[PDB]
C-alpha cells in the first residue's frame, strides 16, 4: 500500500460527525498545551493574549492498517476525520489557528492533531509585575460531549526567549465542569500558567 | 442502532431550511442567556461588548428515534439541522460564535444549541460607574418568522470573577415587536443586564 | 402542500443568477432604508458609520404557487433566490449584514429581503454639531443592471434612543446615475439623512 | 433565447480556470482605475488606504452567442467565467471588493468587470502636505501569467467631493516587471496618483 | 493538446491531500523568502510585521505531460494541487495571502507557488535603531511531515519606501526536534538583519 491507498481507506472509513466510541466507553482524548508566546497582558482588564501548541491525541481503531510493508503514518486534513469538539471555557476571542489543519494518523489507529493557536483569555493577571508572578488558569474541554462520551486527560523548551514575559511554571490537571443547566459533567483540562514580566 | 445510524437517519430526515411546525403550531423556541464576561463598555457611545452562552432549545419531532437499545442523545453539526433565525435587534456587530457549532439532538426530537457568543450592542450604559449600575436591555427574536411560525419563551455561577464588572441582576421577559408598516408581530426575549464597575 | 414542498419547489424553479425579467420589462425593485443607529461621525474626514434595515422587495412570478390550501409565505435563504445586485455608490466599507440572510417569498411571487446593515459612507457631515444638522446623502442602486433591466423605486419608530445623534428627517427620492464611459443609466435611490448631535 | 438560456450556455462553455488565448496570442486585458476616495495616509510609514473602481475588460470568444433575436448583454457571477489574476505588486492588504461580484458579458464575447476595491499600498507619501503633493505609484499586473499569456493595456467626475484630499493628476502608463528568478516579463499598468491635502495656507 | 486539455488532465490526476513522494524519497521543497516590506517593528514586545514573497517549488511527476506540440506551463488554483504544509514556527498571526492563489505547473511536473504573505513574528528586535541593526530569525518548515517525507532546501525586491533598510538576508537549512516527537522536521532559517533608516 502507498500513502494514497491509506488515505483512501481512511476517507471511506472515517465518519467525521461520529464520535468513535468503542463499546459504551468514553473516547479518551489527551490534551497537552505547550506555551510559545505571551503577547499582551492587561492587569486592569485581566486579559491575556497567548500563542500555544495544543497537542491533542485520541484513538480511532477503525482507521488501523497493516504497516509491515507500508508507511505507518500519514497526514490527513481534519475535515476528513472526527476531531474532538474542544473549547476553552474562559476564551474571549475565537481560536486563530496559525498552522495547516492536518492531523497525523498512525497505523494502530492513533490520531494526533497539534494546532498552533493564538487566543485571548479572561484570567487572573494580578501579580504579573511581581517576583511570584501571575497564575492564569485556562480550561479546555468538550463543549457538547459529557464525561460518558469524551474523557480528557492531560500529559520552557518551547517558550520564545523573545517574549517580554517568562514562564515560572505550567500545571495541567484533570478537572470536571458542572452547571445547574445540565445533569451531566464535562471533563476538562485546567492549565495553570504561572508567569511574570522579565 | 449506533451513533452512525442515528446521524445517518437525521441527515435523511432533517430539512435545515424548513421550520419544523407541528400541525400549524408556532415552533416554541426557548432562549436563556448566561452572561460570562463584559469586556468593553462605553458610557459616551452607549455601547457594550459582551460574551454570553445562549442556551437555545426547541423540538423537531421528525428527528425522533427509538432509543430503547440505542443512545438517546447525539451531537450534530448545526448545518445538518433547522436552527431558529434568531437575531439581537440592538446588535451593532455580527455574533462571533466562539465554540464548536454542534447541537445535541434527543431521541424524542428535542434540540439543544448553546453557542458562546461575543457581540456588541447599543444600549443604556448610564450609571455603570454608580452603585445601582447600568441596565443594558438586549432584544433577541426571530428575524423573519412572525408569532404564528415562531414563539420565543425565556427560562453568577457563569460570570467570570476576573471581569472589571460585576452583575447585580439579570431579568429575561417575553416581549413582542411590531412596526406600523406591517401587520405581523415578532416575539422576542428582552434581557435586562443590571451591572456595574467593581469598586476599588 | 406543506412548507417543505414549497421550499423544495422554490429550489427546483429558482435561478439565483438570472434576473427574473417578465417579458422585456425592467424588474421593479423597491428599496426603503430605516435608520437604527449612527455610531461614528467624523466632521474632518466626512465619514459616517451607520446601522440601517434595508427593506428590499421585488417580484419573481416563476416562484408563485397555489396557497388556497397551503401556507402563503415562507422564509428562504437568499443563496436559493435571485437578489438584486444593489450597491451603495459612496460606501467606503463592505456592507456588514448583521441578521440571518433569509428572504420571505409570498405565494404570488413577491420577494422581501430586509438585511440589517452596518456600513461606513463618504458624505457631507458639515453642520452636524449645529441645530439644522448635517445632510448625508446615501446612493443605492444596481451595480451592473441599467434602467432597462432594473428599476429602483423608494417607499422615529426604529431609531435607537441611545445614539449620541438624533434624526431630524429622512427623505428617499428616485434618481439615476450616469458616467462618461458607460452609455447606459443606472437607477438609484437617494437617501438624505438630516441628523445632528444631541 | 432568453437570459436563462444565455447564462446556461455560458456555464456549459466557460472554463473559469482556462485563460482564453485566441491563436497563440496573449489575452489583451485593459485596466483603468477610477479613484473614489483616499481614506488614510501615513507620511511616516509611507502607506495609503484608497477606494477605486477597477474597470477591467477583455475578450473571450467562446462565450459569444447570436443576439439578433435575444439580449446582447447579461450579468454573470465572476465564479462562472475566467477572470484575470490581477494583483497590485505594492499592496500591503488584500483587495476588499465592496460591490457585487458580477461581470457583464457581451454577445460578441467581450467581458467587463468593475469591482470597487478598498486596499492599502506601500508608496511614496512624501509631499502630501505640500502644494505639489505626493505621487503614489500603484502597479497592477497578472501575478502568474507572463507577457506571452497576458498583456495589460491602460485606457474628477468619480472622486468624492468630501475627501480631505484633492487629486492633482492621475497617469496610467503601460509597463513591464522582471526579476532574476524569472526568464519572463510580467506586464503591468503603473498608476501615478498625484494628490494633496485640501485647504493648505 | 491546448490549455483546456492540460488543465482538465491536471484536475483528473492531481491528489491534493497526497504527498507526491517519488520512490522512497522525501519530497524536496525549495523555499526562498524575498522581503518586500517591513511595516511595524516593536523593540519592547519583540514583534515585527513583514511582507514577503515566498517562492516555493517542488515536483509532482504524475502531473507531467508531453509539451513537444503544446504549452509547457499553465496556471492552476492551489486548491486543485498538493501544496506543502509549511508553517512559520515563530509566527504570531495567520499568514495573510495578498495575491491570487495560483501555482504554475511545468510540463516536466515541476510546481511553483509564490504567495505574497503579510505576517507577524516573534523575534529578536534589539539593536534595530543601531548601525549594526537587529537580526530577526524566521523558521519555516513542514508542520506535519518529518525529514523522511519532506526535505526543505533554501535588494532587488525590498520597497525603497520602508522606514527600514535590509543589511543582509541569510537562508540556511536547519532541522527542528523536540522531546514531543522522535522525528525531525526540516526547516529554513531566515536571518533578516535590518535597521531603521
Ligand atoms: O507537539 C507538537 C508536534 C509538533 N510538530 C509536529 C506535528 C506532528 C503531528 C501533528 Cl498532527 N502536527 C504536528 C511541529 C514541529 F514542527 F514542531 C509541534 O508540537
Ligand atoms: O447551557 C449550557 C450548556 C453548556 N455546555 C454544554 C452543552 C450541552 C449541549 C450543547 Cl448543544 N452545547 C453545550 C458547555 C459545558 F462545557 F458547560 C454551557 O451552558
Ligand atoms: O421592514 C422590516 C421588517 C423587519 N423584520 C421582519 C422581517 C420580515 C421579512 C424579512 Cl425578509 N425580514 C425581516 C424584522 C423584525 F424583527 F422586525 C424589520 O424591518
Ligand atoms: O466604469 C464603471 C462602471 C460602473 N458601473 C456600471 C457597471 C457596468 C458593468 C459592470 Cl461589470 N460593472 C459596473 C456602476 C454604476 F453605478 F456606475 C462604475 O464605473
Ligand atoms: O519569485 C517570484 C515570481 C514572481 N511573480 C511571478 C510568478 C510566477 C509563478 C508563480 Cl506560481 N507566481 C508568481 C510575480 C510577478 F508579478 F513578478 C514574483 O516573485
C-alpha radius of gyration, chain D, whole number: 19
Contact between E60 and D58 under an 8 Å Cβ cutoff? The reply is no
Looking at all shown ligands, the one closest to residue D146's CA atom is 5
Contact between A157 and E178 under an 8 Å Cβ cutoff? The reply is yes
Length of chain B: 200
Tell me which chain E residues have a C-beta less than 8 angstroms from the C-beta of D94: 96-98
The strand order across the sheet containing C165-177 reads C86-88, C134-142, C186-197, C165-177
| Interchain pair A96, E92: CB under 8 A | no
Q: For residue B51, how far is its CA from the centre of ligand 2 (angstroms)? A: 15
DSSP SS3 for A13: helix
Residues with CB under 6 Å of ligand 4 are C 89, 143-144, 177, 179, 181-182, 186; D 34, 53, 55, 103-104, 112-114
**Alpha-carbon distance C154 to C188, whole Å?**
9
Q: Exposure of E172 by Cβ count < 10 A (0-12 exposed, 13-18 middle, 19+ buried)? A: exposed
Mutate to test the interface with C, among B61, B92, B121, B186 (most CBs of C within 10 A): B92
Half-sphere exposure of B98 (CA within 13 A, CB side): 23
**Alpha-carbon distance B193 to B133, whole Å?**
10
Half-sphere exposure of A173 (CA within 13 A, CB side): 9
Q: Is D44 on the interface with C (CB under 8 A)?
A: no
Contact between A1 and A7 under an 8 Å Cβ cutoff? The reply is no
Q: For residue D69, how far is its CA from the centre of ligand 4 (angstroms)? A: 25
Q: Is B37 on the interface with A (CB under 8 A)?
A: yes
DSSP-assigned states of every residue in A32-88 = EEEEEEEEEEETTTTEEEEEEEEEEEEE-GGG----TTS-SEEEEEGGGS----EEE
DSSP-assigned states of every residue in E8-26 = HHHHHH--TTS----TTPP
Closest CA to A48 of E91, B162, B165: B162
Which chains have 3+ CB pairs within 8 A of E?
A, D
Three cell numbers, residue D10? 455560458
- Through-space distance between the first and last CA atoms of chain E, rounded to whole angstroms: 53
Q: Could you give the dihedral angle defined by the CA atoms of residues B34, B194, B87 and C193, in that order, rounded to the nearest 10 degrees?
A: -160
Contact between C50 and C118 under an 8 Å Cβ cutoff? The reply is yes
| Interchain pair B92, C3: CB under 8 A | no
Q: Exposure of A122 by Cβ count < 10 A (0-12 exposed, 13-18 middle, 19+ buried)? A: buried
DSSP-assigned states of every residue in C28-44 = EEEEEEEEEEEEEEETT
Half-sphere exposure of D190 (CA within 13 A, CB side): 10
Looking at all shown ligands, the one closest to residue D113's CA atom is 4
Contact between D129 and D197 under an 8 Å Cβ cutoff? The reply is yes
Which chains have 3+ CB pairs within 8 A of A?
B, E
Q: Write the residue with the smallest CA distance to atom 6 of ligand 1.
A: E144
Q: How many CB atoms lie within 10 A of CB C79?
A: 8
Q: Which of residues 136-195 of A touch B (CB under 8 A)?
A: 143-145, 149, 179-181
Instruction: Using CA coordinates, name the residue in chain C closest to B136.
Output: C162
Strands A150-154, A27-42: parallel, antiparallel or unpaired by DSSP?
parallel
b/e sequence D25-61, b meaning 16+ C-beta within 10 Å: ebbebbbbbbbbbbbebeeebbbbbbbbbbbbbbbbe
Q: Is C98 on the interface with D (CB under 8 A)?
A: no
**Alpha-carbon distance C7 to C198, whole Å?**
47
**Alpha-carbon distance B32 to B28, whole Å?**
13
- Through-space distance between the first and last CA atoms of chain A, rounded to whole angstroms: 53
Q: Is E15 on the interface with A (CB under 8 A)?
A: yes
Q: Is A83 on the interface with B (CB under 8 A)?
A: no
DSSP SS3 for E172: strand
Three cell numbers, residue D45? 510609514
Closest CA to D87 of D15, D140, D20, D33: D140
DSSP state of C80: G
**Alpha-carbon distance B49 to B32, whole Å?**
18
Closest CA to B90 of B147, B20, B137, B157: B137
For chain E, the residues before each gap (C–N > 2.5 Å) are 154
The strand order across the sheet containing D165-177 reads D86-88, D134-142, D186-197, D165-177
Closest CA to A14 of A75, A71, A64, A69: A64
**Alpha-carbon distance D99 to D82, whole Å?**
19
Q: For residue D41, how far is its CA from the centre of ligand 4 (angstroms)? A: 27
Nearest residue, CB atoms, E85 vs list A7, A37, A100: A100
Nearest residue, CB atoms, A7 vs list E18, E87, E145: E18
Q: How close does chain E come to D168, measured CA to CA in Å?
A: 22
Ligand 1 mutation pick, A10, A114, A172, max ligand atoms within 8 A of CB:
A114
Q: What percent of chain C is helix, strand and coil (3-state, nearest 5)?
A: 10, 50, 45
b/e sequence A23-59, b meaning 16+ C-beta within 10 Å: eeebbebbbbbbbbbbbebeeebbbbbbbbbbbbbbb
Looking at all shown ligands, the one closest to residue A100's CA atom is 1
Closest CA to A120 of B197, E142, B49: B49
DSSP state of E148: T
Three cell numbers, residue A1? 500500500
Ligand 1 mutation pick, E29, E90, E144, E188, max ligand atoms within 8 A of CB:
E144
Contact between E14 and E63 under an 8 Å Cβ cutoff? The reply is yes
Helix (H) or strand (E) holding E145: none
How far, in Å, are B27, D119, E23 from residue D87 at the CA level? Answer: 50, 11, 38
Helix (H) or strand (E) holding E168: strand E164-176
Specify which residues B74 forms β-bridges with: B105
Three cell numbers, residue C109? 411571487
**Domain assignment of residue B181, given as a range:** 3-17+24-197
C-alpha radius of gyration, chain E, whole number: 19
Contact between D63 and D11 under an 8 Å Cβ cutoff? The reply is no
Q: Exposure of B173 by Cβ count < 10 A (0-12 exposed, 13-18 middle, 19+ buried)? A: exposed
Q: What percent of chain B is helix, strand and coil (3-state, nearest 5)?
A: 10, 50, 45
Contact between D115 and D99 under an 8 Å Cβ cutoff? The reply is yes
| Interchain pair C46, D163: CB under 8 A | yes
**Alpha-carbon distance E143 to E91, whole Å?**
13
Tell me which chain D residues have a C-beta less than 8 angstroms from the C-beta of C178: none
Number of domains in chain C: 1
Instruction: Using CA coordinates, name the residue in chain E closest to D44.
Output: E163
DSSP SS3 for A128: coil
b/e sequence D154-181, b meaning 16+ C-beta within 10 Å: beeebbbebbbbebeebebeebebeeee
E97 lines ligand 5 (CB under 6 A): no
DSSP SS3 for C11: helix
Helix (H) or strand (E) holding A5: helix A3-13
**Alpha-carbon distance D168 to D196, whole Å?**
7
Contact between D176 and D39 under an 8 Å Cβ cutoff? The reply is no
Q: How close does chain E come to A53, measured CA to CA in Å?
A: 10
Three cell numbers, residue D191? 498608476
Contact between B144 and C75 under an 8 Å Cβ cutoff? The reply is yes
DSSP state of E83: -
Strands E73-77, D186-197: parallel, antiparallel or unpaired by DSSP?
unpaired
**Alpha-carbon distance B59 to B26, whole Å?**
11
CA angle B139, B145, B148 (to 5 degrees): 105
In the block, cell 514575559 appears at A165
For the CA of D178, the closest atom of ligand 5 is 17
Residues with CB under 6 Å of ligand 2 are A 89, 141, 143-144, 177, 179, 181-182, 186; B 34, 53, 55, 103-104, 112-114
Length of chain A: 198
For the CA of E89, the closest atom of ligand 1 is 16
**Alpha-carbon distance B85 to C104, whole Å?**
12
C-alpha radius of gyration, chain B, whole number: 19
Instruction: Using CA coordinates, name the residue in chain D closest to E40.
Output: D45
Q: Is E124 on the interface with A (CB under 8 A)?
A: yes
Q: Write the residue with the smallest CA distance to atom 9 of ligand 4.
A: C144
| Interchain pair A100, E90: CB under 8 A | no
Contact between B88 and B139 under an 8 Å Cβ cutoff? The reply is yes
**Alpha-carbon distance D155 to D136, whole Å?**
19
C and D make contact (3+ CB pairs below 8 Å):
yes
How far, in Å, are B93, B106, B158 from residue B112 at the CA level? Answer: 24, 8, 18
Q: Please state the three-class secondary structure of chain D as a single string.
A: CCHHHHHHHHHHHCCCCCCCCCCCCCEEEEEEEEEEEEEEEECCCCEEEEEEEEEEEEECHHHCCCCCCCCCEEEEEHHHCCCCCEEECCECCCCEECCCCEEEEECCCEEEECCEEEEEEECCCCCCCCCCCEEEEEEEEECCCCCCCEEEEECCCCCCCCCCEEEEEEEEEEEEECCCCCCCCEEEEEEEEEEEECCCC
Q: Is D37 on the interface with C (CB under 8 A)?
A: yes
Q: For residue E143, how far is its CA from the centre of ligand 1 (angstroms)? A: 6
Three cell numbers, residue B165? 464588572
Q: For residue B156, how far is its CA from the centre of ligand 2 (angstroms)? A: 16
Length of chain E: 197
Looking at all shown ligands, the one closest to residue D97's CA atom is 4
Looking at all shown ligands, the one closest to residue C187's CA atom is 4
Residue D71: CATH number of its domain:
2.70.170.10
Nearest residue, CB atoms, C99 vs list B45, B47, B87: B87
| Interchain pair C164, B45: CB under 8 A | yes
**Alpha-carbon distance B186 to B177, whole Å?**
5
Closest CA to D15 of D112, D85, D74, D83: D83
Amino acid at each position: 500500500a502507498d500513502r494514497a491507498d491509506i488515505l483512501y481507506n481512511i476517507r471511506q472509513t472515517s465518519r467525521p460527525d461520529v464520535i468513535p466510541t468503542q463499546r459504551d466507553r468514553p473516547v479518551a482524548v489527551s490534551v497537552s498545551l505547550k506555551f510559545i508566546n505571551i503577547l499582551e497582558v492587561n492587569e486592569i482588564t485581566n486579559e491575556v493574549d497567548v500563542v500555544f501548541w495544543q497537542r491533542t491525541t485520541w484513538s480511532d481503531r477503525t482507521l488501523a492498517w497493516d504497516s509491515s510493508h507500508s508507511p505507518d503514518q500519514v497526514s490527513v486534513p481534519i475535515s476528513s476525520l472526527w476531531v474532538p469538539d474542544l473549547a476553552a471555557y474562559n476564551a474571549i476571542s475565537k481560536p486563530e489557528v496559525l498552522t495547516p489543519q492536518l492531523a497525523r494518523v498512525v497505523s494502530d489507529g492513533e490520531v494526533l492533531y497539534v494546532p498552533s493557536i493564538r487566543q485571548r483569555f479572561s484570567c487572573d493577571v494580578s501579580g504579573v509585575d511581581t517576583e511570584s508572578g501571575a497564575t492564569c488558569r485556562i480550561k479546555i474541554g468538550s463543549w457538547t460531549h459529557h464525561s460518558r462520551e469524551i474523557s480528557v486527560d492531560p500529559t520552557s523548551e518551547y517558550f520564545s526567549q523573545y517574549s517580554r514575559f517568562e514562564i515560572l511554571d505550567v500545571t495541567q490537571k484533570k478537572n470536571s465542569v458542572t452547571y445547574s443547566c445540565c445533569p451531566e459533567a464535562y471533563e476538562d483540562v485546567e492549565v495553570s500558567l504561572n508567569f511574570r514580566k522579565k
